């Protein structure tokens, strides 16, 4: 299938950047 | 700890820590075996170097 | 798309050598 | 017994001259390029 | 990772977690070994198994065929796949005689305090040396070739074109 | 595995050197003779028996 | 002097697990569009 | 049958066991003679 | 450092003792190495060509080795040529 | 001109080196620190932090 | 008293950065060339270096990746001619004659010199020993044979070390096949500078960590047995000298913190200064060793040895470098 | 003090070739083509 | 037991230690030194390479090499008593059994010298930093020496032990690998390079931050190795680099830790890229540009000048730096720009 | 061969004038570990 | 230029991951 | 019960820096390698 080749890593930093910033968050809560 | 059926079956396999012979014990026995151990590294080495030569060995794809 | 990707990480370098210098931790004696 | 300054300076210049033979191997016999 | 507390773990006198590493490789050697030799005799021999992958010198005939030991010293020539098996069987029981052997007799004294064989991290130390020493020799069999890395399913190798292996029997 | 093997050797050292010197990776003992160090002091380097 | 407005941010393990259920089924929905 | 190849092998087998044989059998003599008091 | 207990290097090579014998040893090994060469001996124990040694009178092919098991007979093989 | 090009401008740039060499010394000797700095009397001890 | 002002701010040793009156200069002139660099390794068109109409295209957005980006040369029909933009008739004639590359390096060098002088000025304000700035002229001298010594000795700033990686590794080709240098004593001089600071680097590195007094646990790094600016030191000299006095012999090891420290500065300082030296000096054409068919037998063959398939190897290089800038027999330019 | 020792024979094993292979090499610089 | 008696006369305290590892470490070392030294006096390369390469021969020090054995031998052991040299001492030189000689007894010196490092910091009570920094030497001495020419046909392509012959190596990896292009030398040139940084202004910071322990000039007297203070300011040299650089060292062990981390490190991604090459797998080339250089005979890149320099050293050099291909190429296939 | 014999000779001379000049001092070591 | 497809996302995976690790610890170090 | 082994973890401010670094020029050495 032809499909859009950013698709790949447009898909993939939709998910790590979000993903990232709420472990961030939540590691160093537990820390505290 | 906890007990568990399977530990109490592998118990004994585990109850002997720390435990020795005294002095060098078997030490010559298991440095002979390193010593035929290394003389048959040897010689197979030498075997694929080629630098052994033995007949009805032909170190080839041809065999 | 290469240079772009070049330039980035080039400007996050320049960016980290800011806050290692201004932002650094302060040693204390 | 003999005073070391001596040695270091025999022995020194024994040096610059088994060295100085070699470079004037450099320009005569083999590997003078003549 | 739970239940990380067993009682298995715990040393009868002491209480403290200890593991006996000497009759730990004894068993596993002796693992070790029956498995090897069920390899080789089963497995590798078609007794009970598919065999292996073997061909024609310049590998144009290739298939999956079972194989007879070879007990000769041609069995250490490694583009015989008979030495394989050979070793297998031959390595499996020494395997299984020294897995007993290192389950029934204690480590001497001297040896257990210089090899350190009350901290694991000696074990780790070497058998990380025995897997280099593993990992250097499958790169050497596959570059150079051998039985075990035929021409059919990994390519042929640089020194046949060196030597113009394939342009002399053409 | 040519390189992976290479960098295996490192392993070994290292894991290696952990086992043996275990005692003393976190640092020597704070106040270490120097006599222990200084030569012609002991017979045999490091025995504590065997100052001449 | 240290700044007097600085609160400690916070986000326990509840918030976490929805937050990446979030993300993820977002993602699951909106990839087959990013390749179109 | 022994190859002249196996010939040169066991020969190198010996030379280097009289080599590590006479390096021990020199050592081991020197430290007795010397011990450490 | 103190020091290990051996005869220090400095009063040695300073002692006549010394230089009595090592007024004979060293240079008796520099004629001795000298003799090695002028006798023409290392050539014939190394396997050195001299000068006159790496052609035959009207040849410029190097006597390169090719076979791997029979590479003493073709080295000796170059020697006869010559 | 090879010999006298080369020649020189390695003493040109050692003698550069030189002036370095004697300038800050003299410069560290007039102030009165140029075997080291006082203990009892460290300047950087005394000044404030950069952070 | 307002001019005095300006003065105190200047040599002010609370100021985050140093300024300084060497500052005054290298701020700016760094500042200049920093951009023009960064602009230049982007942005810029292809440049004829060779002056025989042949662009080479150097920046990132003409098909460059970082490897093979570079900054280029001014054009050989330039020479040694001083380029700035107002001696162009348009920024494109500029960019086209390789203007950025003397803007650049000319900002640069006069920036690093700064640079080393700057060095000085804080040692004197803060009471130090002002020697650091005399280890630094050991690659400052580098770049000068590379950017500034080696143009003026050929006649060209087209000769120069291309601000780029792969520009960098044809200018040390192009060299070997002109100078030799890898048989010319100062860069062995060099070699035995960066080796050796590299190995006593490491050396110097593994005795102090292996010496170092148990102050923390197994469960923390061992740097947090050192608090910055505590009155002992954190290691045991005497142990570490024990050590390496026994892996050699005791004479062959440094018991002199000072000593040991001044050497580890004397060693490869001194070996850069060398090699420095030898681009500088093989930049009026005293070329390395030249041992092409020295041996010689009997009848009068050649006999080759190691440096005759070196020479073959330099032939290759020499027939090649700028393929179409040759007319005549003999590459003197 | 002792004469023979370790360190007399790490010397000699260095020091007694190497003045016989200054010698040779001391007549090589004599051999003409 | 005569165990315990030997260990105590092995690890006595003398000029030159000896121990466990001086049983491997002193003779190999020994063989593999002297083994050059009399190769480079003595023995030739002229029935390997074609080569003179002996004081004998008239080669002087920069051009003396001990070479590596010929195409013909494969990766042979070139033993002695082996089935090449058949215990002709004679005959063994001129087939280049000295270059195996020195390369495998030199080899288990390495060993025994890494050994002897273990040895003696258990002895003294330190720990084995010193050992584990020197694996770098051997990582690079296993890949490049004995790895490399394993991968590759012979020991013939290995380096050969001498001055010009190094060289050699040197623009033999440019011209067919272009090794200069591989991003693993160039950690390892930074490594290097880095570490003379290092080692540099680590030496003048400490020699210039010197505290006042004497009234001389020269301050080495101003020393005693049993002083428990330290004989710089650390404080005044981190507000000096803070100011100058921006940043600065502000912990010794993690200063002196580094030290270590940047050379040795640098020479393991060196030896990493050498094993590839072992395989001519090398970062020779850029497929994105050698298709647009194919298709633009106008693009040009100081890539692309680079490979025409490696086209030149290959075709020119080959034949005599490979006499066993019995290469013969007529001028006119020779690669050559104008004039010259 | 001869040579062999021409190139040891010294060789052996040496030794020899050493030992006679440090036998008296040689023995007595061994006297003394013994 | 006709480069890797492949090129960009491997580039971005192997800053954005091992850096990612990095904060991580940090953020929770100074949380401690 | 809870498990007496684990441990804290900790990664300074600099050694952020220093680990951000040695990413960030890794990845601007073999990026051009990546995209061939
Ligand atoms: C950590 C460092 C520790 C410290 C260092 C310790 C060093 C100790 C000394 C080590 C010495 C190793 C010697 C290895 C000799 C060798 O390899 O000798 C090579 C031989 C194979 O010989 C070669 O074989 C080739 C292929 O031939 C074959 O193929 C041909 C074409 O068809 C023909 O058919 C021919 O008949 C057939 O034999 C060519 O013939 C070559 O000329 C011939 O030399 O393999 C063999 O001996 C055995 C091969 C299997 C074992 C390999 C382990 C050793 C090597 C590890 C690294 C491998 C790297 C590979 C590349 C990466
Ligand atoms: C650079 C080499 C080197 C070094 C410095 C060390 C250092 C160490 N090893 Mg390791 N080791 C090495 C290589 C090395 N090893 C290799 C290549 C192997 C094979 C896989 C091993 C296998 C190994 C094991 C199994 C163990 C160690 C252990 C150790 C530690 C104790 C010393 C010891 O046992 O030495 C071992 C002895 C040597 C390295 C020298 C051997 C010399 C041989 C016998 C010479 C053979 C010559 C040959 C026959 C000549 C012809 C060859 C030719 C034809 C090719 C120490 C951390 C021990 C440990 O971890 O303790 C906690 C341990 O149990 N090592
Ligand atoms: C094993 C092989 C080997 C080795 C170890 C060396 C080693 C060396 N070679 Mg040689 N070389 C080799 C093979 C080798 N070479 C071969 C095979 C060839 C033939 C192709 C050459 C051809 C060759 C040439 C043509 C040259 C060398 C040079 C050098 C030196 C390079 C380092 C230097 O100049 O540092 C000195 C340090 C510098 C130049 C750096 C200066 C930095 C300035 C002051 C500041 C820069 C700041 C920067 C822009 C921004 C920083 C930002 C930051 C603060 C955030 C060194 C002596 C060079 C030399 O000797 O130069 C004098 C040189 O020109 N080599
Ligand atoms: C630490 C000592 C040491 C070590 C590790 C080595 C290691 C090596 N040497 Mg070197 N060598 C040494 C000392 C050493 N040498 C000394 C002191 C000399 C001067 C006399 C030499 C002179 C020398 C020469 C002249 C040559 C070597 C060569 C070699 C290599 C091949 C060795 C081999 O195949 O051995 C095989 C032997 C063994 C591994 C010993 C095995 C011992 C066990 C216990 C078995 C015992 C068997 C038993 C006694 C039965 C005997 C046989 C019987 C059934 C008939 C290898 C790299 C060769 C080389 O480099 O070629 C290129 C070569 O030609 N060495
Ligand atoms: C700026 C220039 C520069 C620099 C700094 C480097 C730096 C480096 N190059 Mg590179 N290189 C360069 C330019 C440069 N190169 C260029 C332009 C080319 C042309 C393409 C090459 C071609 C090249 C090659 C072909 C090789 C390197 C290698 C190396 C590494 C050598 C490490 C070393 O010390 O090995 C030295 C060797 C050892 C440390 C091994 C152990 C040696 C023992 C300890 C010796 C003991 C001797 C004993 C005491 C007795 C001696 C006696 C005798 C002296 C009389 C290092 C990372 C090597 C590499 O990557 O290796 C992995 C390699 O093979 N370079
Ligand atoms: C516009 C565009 C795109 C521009 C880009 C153009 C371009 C060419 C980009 C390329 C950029 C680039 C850097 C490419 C190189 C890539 C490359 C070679 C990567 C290799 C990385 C890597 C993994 C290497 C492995 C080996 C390794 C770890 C080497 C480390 C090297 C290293 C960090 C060296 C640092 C040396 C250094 C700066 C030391 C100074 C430290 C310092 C200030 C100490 C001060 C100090 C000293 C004292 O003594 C004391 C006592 C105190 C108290 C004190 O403070
Ligand atoms: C090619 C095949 C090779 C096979 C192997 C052959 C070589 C094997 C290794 C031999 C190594 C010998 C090293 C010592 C030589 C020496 O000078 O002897 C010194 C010793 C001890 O001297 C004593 O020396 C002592 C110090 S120390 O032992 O020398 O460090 C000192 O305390 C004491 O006063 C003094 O009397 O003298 C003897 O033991 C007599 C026998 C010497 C042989
Ligand atoms: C240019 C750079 C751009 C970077 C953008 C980064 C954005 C990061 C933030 C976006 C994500 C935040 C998510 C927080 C998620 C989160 O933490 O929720 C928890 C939060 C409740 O907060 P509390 O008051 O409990 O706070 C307690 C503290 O621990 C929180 O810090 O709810 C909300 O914030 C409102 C939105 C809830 C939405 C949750 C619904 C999810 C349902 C499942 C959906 C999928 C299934 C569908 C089935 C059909
Ligand atoms: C060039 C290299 C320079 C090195 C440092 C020079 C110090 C320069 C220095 O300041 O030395 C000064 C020192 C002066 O010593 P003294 O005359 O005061 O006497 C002290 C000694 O004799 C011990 O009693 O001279 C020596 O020790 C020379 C020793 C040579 C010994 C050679 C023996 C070699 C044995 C084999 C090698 C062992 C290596 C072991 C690991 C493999
Ligand atoms: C006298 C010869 C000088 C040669 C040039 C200078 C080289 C050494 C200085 C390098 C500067 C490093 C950066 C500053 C490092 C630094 O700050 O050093 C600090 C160090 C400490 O000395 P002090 O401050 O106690 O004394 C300086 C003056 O006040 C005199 O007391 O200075 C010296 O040791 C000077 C040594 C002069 C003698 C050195 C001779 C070395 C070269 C010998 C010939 C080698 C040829 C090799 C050919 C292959
Ligand atoms: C092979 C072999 C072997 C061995 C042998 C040997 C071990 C020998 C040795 C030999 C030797 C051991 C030799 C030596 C030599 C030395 C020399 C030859 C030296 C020289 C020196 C010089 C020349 C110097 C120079 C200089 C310097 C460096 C300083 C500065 C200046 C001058 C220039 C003075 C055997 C029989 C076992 C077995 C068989 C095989
Ligand atoms: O421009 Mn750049 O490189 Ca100095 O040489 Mn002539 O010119 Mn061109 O050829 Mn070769
Ligand atoms: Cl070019
Ligand atoms: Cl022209
Ligand atoms: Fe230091």
Chains 1, 15 share one sequence.
Not at chain 13, 135 to 156: D, E, H, K, R, T
Request: include cysteine.
């Amino acid at each position: 299938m032809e499909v859009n080749q950013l698709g790949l890593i447009a898909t993939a930093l939709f998910v790590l950047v979000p993903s990232v910033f709420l472990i961030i968050l939540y590691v160093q809560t537990e820390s505290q | 700890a906890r007990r568990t059926w399977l530990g109490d079956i592998l118990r004994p396999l585990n109850s002997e820590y720390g435990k020795v012979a005294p002095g060098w014990g078997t030490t010559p026995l298991m440095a002979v075996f390193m010593g035929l151990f290394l003389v048959f590294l040897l010689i197979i080495l030498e075997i694929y170097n080629s630098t052994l030569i033995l007949d009805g060995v032909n170190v080839s794809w041809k065999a | 798309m290469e240079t772009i990707t070049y330039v980035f990480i080039f400007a996050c370098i320049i960016a980290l050598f800011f806050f290692a210098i201004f932002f650094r931790e302060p040693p204390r004696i | 017994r003999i005073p070391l300054w001596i040695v270091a300076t025999v022995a020194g210049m024994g040096v610059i001259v088994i060295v100085g033979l070699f470079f004037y191997g450099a320009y005569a016999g083999l590997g003078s390029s003549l | 990772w739970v239940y990380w507390d067993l009682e298995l773990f715990r040393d009868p006198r002491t209480g403290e977690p200890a593991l006996d590493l000497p009759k730990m490789f004894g068993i596993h050697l002796f693992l070790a070994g029956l498995l090897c030799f069920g390899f080789g005799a089963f497995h590798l021999t078609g007794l009970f198994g598919p065999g292996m992958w073997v061909s024609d010198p310049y590998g144009l005939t290739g298939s999956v065929q079972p194989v007879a030991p070879e007990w000769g010293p041609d069995g250490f020539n490694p583009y015989n796949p008979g030495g394989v098996v050979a070793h297998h069987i031959a390595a499996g029981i020494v395997g299984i005689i020294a897995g007993l052997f290192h389950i029934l007799v204690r480590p001497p004294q001297r040896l257990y305090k210089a090899l350190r064989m009350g901290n694991i991290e000696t074990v780790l130390s070497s058998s990380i040396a025995a897997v280099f020493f593993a990992a250097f020799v499958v790169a050497g069999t596959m570059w150079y070739g051998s039985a075990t890395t035929p021409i059919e399913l990994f390519g042929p190798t640089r020194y046949q074109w060196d030597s113009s292996y394939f342009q002399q029997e053409i | 595995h040519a390189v992976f093997a290479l960098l295996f050797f490192f392993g070994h050292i290292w894991h290696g050197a952990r086992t043996l010197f275990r005692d003393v990776f976190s640092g020597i003992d704070p106040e270490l003779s120097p006599e222990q160090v200084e030569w012609g002091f002991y017979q045999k380097v490091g025995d504590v028996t065997t100052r001449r | 002097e240290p700044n007097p407005n600085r609160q400690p941010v916070e986000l326990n393990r509840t918030s976490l697990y929805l937050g990446l259920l979030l993300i993820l089924v977002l993602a699951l929905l909106f990839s087959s569009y990013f390749f179109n | 049958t022994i190859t002249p190849s196996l010939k040169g092998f066991f020969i190198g087998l010996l030379s280097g066991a009289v080599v590590l044989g006479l390096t021990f059998a020199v050592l081991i003599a020197i430290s007795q003679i010397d011990k450490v008091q | 450092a103190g020091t290990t207990g051996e005869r220090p290097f400095s009063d040695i090579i300073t002692s006549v003792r010394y230089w009595v014998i090592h007024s004979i040893t060293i240079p008796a090994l520099f004629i001795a190495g000298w003799l090695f060469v002028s006798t023409g001996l290392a050539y014939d124990v190394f396997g050195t060509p001299r000068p006159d040694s790496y052609y035959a009178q009207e040849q410029r092919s190097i006597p390169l080795v090719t076979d791997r098991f029979e590479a003493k007979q073709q080295v000796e093989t170059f020697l006869e040529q010559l | 001109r090879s010999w006298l090009a080369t020649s020189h401008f390695v003493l040109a740039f050692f003698f550069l080196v030189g002036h370095l060499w004697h300038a800050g010394r003299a410069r560290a000797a007039a102030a009165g620190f140029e075997k080291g700095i006082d203990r009892e009397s460290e300047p950087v001890l005394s000044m404030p932090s950069l952070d | 008293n307002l001019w005095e002002r300006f003065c105190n701010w200047v040599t002010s040793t609370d100021n985050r950065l140093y300024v300084g009156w060497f500052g005054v200069i290298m701020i700016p002139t760094l500042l200049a060339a920093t951009i023009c660099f960064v602009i230049a390794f982007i942005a810029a068109p292809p440049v004829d270096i060779d002056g025989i109409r042949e662009p080479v295209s150097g920046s990132l957005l003409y098909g460059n990746n970082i490897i093979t980006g570079a900054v280029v040369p001014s054009s050989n029909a330039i020479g040694l001619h001083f380029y700035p933009i107002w001696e162009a008739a348009s920024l494109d004639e500029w960019l086209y004659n390789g203007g950025p590359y003397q803007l650049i390096i000319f900002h640069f060098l006069l920036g690093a010199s700064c640079y080393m002088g700057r060095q000085w000025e804080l040692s004197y304000r803060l009471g130090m020993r002002p020697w650091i700035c005399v280890a630094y002229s050991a690659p400052l001298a580098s770049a000068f044979a590379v950017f500034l010594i080696y143009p003026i000795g050929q006649g060209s700033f087209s000769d120069g070390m291309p601000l780029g990686i792969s520009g960098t590794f044809n200018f040390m080709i192009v060299f070997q096949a002109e100078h030799n240098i890898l048989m010319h004593p100062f860069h062995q001089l060099g070699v035995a500078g960066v080796f050796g600071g590299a190995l006593f680097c490491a050396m110097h590195g593994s005795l102090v960590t292996s010496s170092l007094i148990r102050e923390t646990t197994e469960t923390e790094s061992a740097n947090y047995g050192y608090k910055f600016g505590q009155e002992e030191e954190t290691y045991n000299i005497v142990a570490a000298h024990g050590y390496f006095g026994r892996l050699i012999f005791q004479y062959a090891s440094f018991n002199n913190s000072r000593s040991l420290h001044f050497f580890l500065a004397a060693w490869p300082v001194v070996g850069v200064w060398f090699t420095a030296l030898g681009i500088s000096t093989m930049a009026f054409n005293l070329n390395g060793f030249n041992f092409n068919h020295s041996v010689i037998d009997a009848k009068g063959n050649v006999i080759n040895t190691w440096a005759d398939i070196i020479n073959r190897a330099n032939l290759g290089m020499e027939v090649m470098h700028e393929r179409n800038a040759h007319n005549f027999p003999l590459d003197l330019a | 003090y002792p004469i023979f020792t370790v360190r007399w024979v790490a010397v000699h094993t260095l020091a007694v070739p190497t003045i016989f292979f200054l010698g040779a090499i001391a007549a090589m610089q004599f051999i003409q083509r | 037991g005569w165990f315990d008696i030997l260990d105590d006369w092995l690890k006595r305290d003398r000029f030159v230690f000896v121990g466990w590892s001086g049983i491997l470490l002193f003779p190999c070392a020994y063989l593999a030194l002297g083994g050059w030294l009399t190769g480079t006096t003595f023995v030739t390369s002229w029935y390997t390479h074609g080569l003179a390469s002996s004081y004998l021969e008239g080669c002087n020090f920069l051009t003396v090499a001990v070479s590596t054995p010929a195409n013909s031998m494969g990766h042979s052991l070139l033993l002695l008593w082996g089935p090449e040299a058949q215990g002709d001492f004679t005959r063994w030189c001129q087939l280049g059994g000295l270059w195996t000689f020195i390369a495998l007894h030199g080899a288990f010196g390495l060993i025994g010298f890494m050994l002897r490092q273990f040895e003696i910091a258990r002895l003294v009570g330190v720990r084995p930093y010193n050992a584990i920094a020197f694996s770098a030497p051997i990582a690079v001495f296993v890949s490049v020496f004995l790895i490399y020419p394993l991968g590759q046909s012979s020991w013939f392509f290995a380096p050969s032990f001498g001055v010009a012959a190094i060289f050699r190596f040197l623009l033999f990896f440019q011209g067919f690998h272009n090794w200069t292009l591989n991003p693993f030398h160039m950690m390892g040139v930074a490594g290097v390079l880095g570490g003379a940084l290092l080692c540099a202004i680590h030496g003048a910071t400490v020699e210039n931050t010197l505290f006042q322990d004497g009234e001389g000039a020269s301050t080495f007297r101003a020393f005693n190795p049993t002083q428990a203070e330290e004989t710089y300011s650390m404080v005044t040299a981190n507000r000096f680099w803070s100011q100058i650089f921006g940043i600065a060292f502000s912990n010794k062990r993690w200063l002196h830790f580094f030290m270590l981390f940047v050379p040795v490190t640098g020479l393991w991604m060196s030896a990493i890229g050498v094993v590839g090459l072992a395989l001519n797998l090398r970062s020779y080339d850029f497929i994105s540009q050698e298709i647009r250089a194919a298709e633009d005979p106008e693009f040009e890149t100081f890539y692309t000048k680079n490979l025409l320099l490696n086209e030149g050293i290959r075709a020119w050099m080959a034949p005599q730096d490979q006499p066993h291909e019995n290469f013969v190429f007529p001028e006119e296939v020779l690669p050559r720009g104008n004039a010259l | 061969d001869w040579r062999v014999l021409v190139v040891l000779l010294p060789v052996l001379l040496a030794a020899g004038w050493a030992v006679r000049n440090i036998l008296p001092y040689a023995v007595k070591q061994v006297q003394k570990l013994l």
